[PDB]
Design a protein around this ligand. Structure first.
Ligand SMILES: Nc1ncnc2c1ncn2[C@@H]1O[C@H](COP(=O)(O)OP(=O)(O)OP(=O)(O)O)[C@@H](O)[C@H]1O
Ligand SMILES: Nc1ncnc2c1ncn2[C@@H]1O[C@H](COP(=O)(O)OP(=O)(O)OP(=O)(O)O)[C@@H](O)[C@H]1O
Ligand SMILES: [Mg+2]
Ligand SMILES: [Mg+2]
Ligand SMILES: [Zn+2]
Ligand SMILES: [Zn+2]
Lengths: 296, 274
């Protein structure tokens, strides 16, 4: 794989594919990419930082189980009696299996950074005219083990979220599709923006992907990482229509179910794209690129 | 509780006790506290940043299941066939329970930041004279639901780790017991060092029951034996770590100095940038 050779200076193995320790070099680039995205934050955008976990009921309510049940990471623990727990530990001491005593928690590992904002916005009452803007970030989890550096199980997602009228969301999504391209250009990255679909699970998933594809609810900024034939989605421009507005009872300035959209930045994918494109020696990175990332 | 009102300017509810969204105000303070801890990093310290998850087998081998089996957050998923997964979702649609189809993954949510460092160090062969120093950080998880702001289920842990002879670890722990106190003093915090485990305790809820915001943990040759880490003399390596509770230190700052950064002491504002 063309990315493999980057692994030595960027990561350390943690005994699980797509779960790596980040080196000081890798992390300074993720941080500078994070700061760069912050510099493009529109005015009146509320910044929220989410933990790696969220409410299981909120995620169930958002329809994620119907879409990607195979990717979901659910939190599990020993919630039994002291007797039950001591027995589970004893089986583990005796070389047996303690995990049979596991039961689900009321938490899941967040599969996308924006899920938790909708309930938070719903709790504030009706939206003002112009809607609401959020800047969200989270360490996400998707059960997709791979040896490829651009397909992780644990990865950082930064997003700008629009909640409002279909016009508010549409304007936002157009403004962002322009800005996201200017950012990837400034970073010296080769890309193309194309219509796309979410990887919906199963037979129904195929129909759902095809419908989303033609409705143009999803665009992606694709960067060639392993091949020019199969580029990697490093940014997403998603229009949810009134899905979250209806689910959470978010109301427009005009009392209608609110429309939502989000621009997602794959922090780990963008950092890998930078190192693949420009190499592991920062002193050799183009001056324009080094300048925008605050180096020099 | 004396911390409760802090929540308005600090957090947003996420529908689970001890799991909150951080505001821009709270987050800038966590970041500045993180940068401050970095400025005290001794020469030759390797910086590693860990994700919220780690190997389940590595944690099982650490001895954590023996100690706090009730706190451990394991990762579970639907690893069945497409037929089984579609049926699980269908049971949920029909008012049943989809979770019966869950099975454990090979991952856990990390309960302490240092755990993954030991197999990484072990893979490098014998330790040089003087041992190895690491600077690690992770978003940790402990299944301890609470309404108190100083006791979270998802929280940030920053740590400096020493791997070497009992002398290397002892020197390191003496150096950090001093440095940790200088940091808390510089930050204008009221503390007492107590509790082999040191804790730097700060009153947040009460002066009677202060909160452990920093700690030194000595692990003996536990990880050295478990992972086959050999010092320069070929003996099982000893390990120690100084832990900083990022969320607890952020809450301690706001409790001590208030939510208005412009009113924070000039020395405190200076050391944190600002
Ligand atoms: N498994 C992953 N590893 C690393 N980064 C990822 C992964 N999945 C998504 N991302 C990043 O987070 C962004 C937002 O997530 P999104 O739901 O739009 O992804 P996706 O449609 O599943 O992408 P892909 O087709 O590659 O699986 C992506 O554009 C990408 O930049
Ligand atoms: N549940 C928690 N919520 C927030 N921060 C925590 C929590 N547990 C531990 N910490 C922080 O992580 C640091 C190192 O963790 P450690 O295992 O040493 O603490 P602990 O003895 O379990 O603390 P406590 O007695 O309060 O439970 C602590 O010193 C504290 O700063
Ligand atoms: Mg996906
Ligand atoms: Mg504890
Ligand atoms: Zn989103
Ligand atoms: Zn530790």
């Amino acid at each position: 794989d063309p990315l493999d050779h980057l692994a030595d200076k960027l990561f350390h193995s943690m005994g699980s594919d797509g779960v790596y320790a980040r080196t000081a070099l890798y992390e300074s680039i993720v941080e500078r990419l994070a700061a760069l995205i912050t510099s493009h934050r529109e005015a009146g955008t509320e910044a929220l930082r989410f933990p790696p976990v969220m409410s299981r009921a909120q995620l169930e309510k958002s329809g994620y189980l119907k879409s990607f049940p195979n990717l979901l990471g659910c939190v599990c623990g020993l919630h039994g009696t002291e007797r039950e727990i001591n027995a589970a530990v004893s089986r583990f001491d005796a070389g047996g299996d303690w995990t049979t005593s596991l039961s689900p928690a009321d938490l899941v590992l967040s599969p996308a950074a924006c899920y938790p904002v909708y309930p938070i916005a719903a709790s504030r009452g009706p939206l003002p005219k112009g809607g609401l803007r959020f800047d969200v970030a989270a360490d996400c989890f998707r059960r997709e083990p791979s040896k490829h550096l651009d397909r992780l199980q644990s990865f950082r997602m930064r997003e700008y979220v629009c909640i409002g009228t279909p016009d508010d969301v549409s304007d936002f999504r157009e403004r962002w599709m322009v800005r996201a391209q200017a950012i990837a250009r400034d970073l010296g990255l080769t890309f193309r923006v194309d219509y796309a679909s979410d990887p919906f699970f199963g037979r129904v998933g195929q129909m759902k992907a095809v419908s989303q594809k033609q409705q143009q609810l999803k665009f992606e900024l694709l960067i060639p990482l392993r091949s020019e034939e199969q580029p990697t989605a490093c940014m997403s421009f998603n229009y949810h229509r009134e899905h979250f507005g209806t689910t959470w009872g978010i109301q427009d300035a005009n009392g209608e179910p609110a429309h939502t959209g989000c621009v997602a930045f794959g922090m780990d994918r963008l950092a890998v794209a930078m190192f693949h494109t420009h190499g592991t020696d920062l002193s050799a990175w183009p001056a324009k690129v080094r300048d925008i990332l605050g180096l020099q």
